[PDB]
Amino acid sequence: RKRLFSKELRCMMYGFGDDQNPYTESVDILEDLVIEFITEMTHKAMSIGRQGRVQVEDIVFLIRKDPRKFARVKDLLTMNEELKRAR
């Protein structure tokens, strides 16, 4: 595997207080957390609801585990409609 999140993740670590120039072996770690996080929220999402990937079951795991992932997914679903109402 190559790194599909090498330049994007360096902007994000700067966004949360790291540095303007993070180490390469620290973006090596964070790039493998995200690929496992998307895998271990899709392998468990294809057994709940139905054997597909509708987003009405992505919102189930975010409650009762961490409320920040739920309060930041209700903002991305509300603002999808306020950005199509403007057109």
């Binding site: 599909l4 540095d19 993070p22 964070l30 995200v34 271990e40 990937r53 999808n80």
Partner: protein
């Protein structure tokens, strides 16, 4: 100040690209996903990165080191997050009654 305004710019404008996560999720499902799935899944993973870096800078502030983040503060970040159940692993069948 003049660094807080640059840091707040990177906190909001940065995102994983939707053209790659839609390629990444569909390699796990097999057939297809929707646009409102990729919009949410690209947004939760930014919170999860912000769950680690905001907590890996608590590991670095606890020990006697500076802002550059070594991997010592990053393996410790995943260790402290997993002990509070924040990092989900669907390959460890846990058992609470013994």
């Amino acid at each position: 100040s003049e660094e807080q305004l640059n840091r707040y710019e990177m906190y909001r404008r940065s995102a994983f690209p939707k053209a790659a996560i839609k390629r990444l999720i569909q390699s796990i499902t097999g057939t297809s996903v929707s646009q409102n799935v990729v919009i949410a899944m690209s947004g939760i993973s930014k919170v999860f990165v912000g769950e680690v870096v905001e907590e890996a800078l608590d590991v670095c502030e606890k020990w006697g080191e500076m802002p550059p983040l070594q991997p010592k503060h990053m393996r410790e970040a995943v260790r402290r997050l997993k002990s509070k159940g924040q990092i989900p692993n669907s390959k460890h069948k846990k058992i609470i009654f013994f």
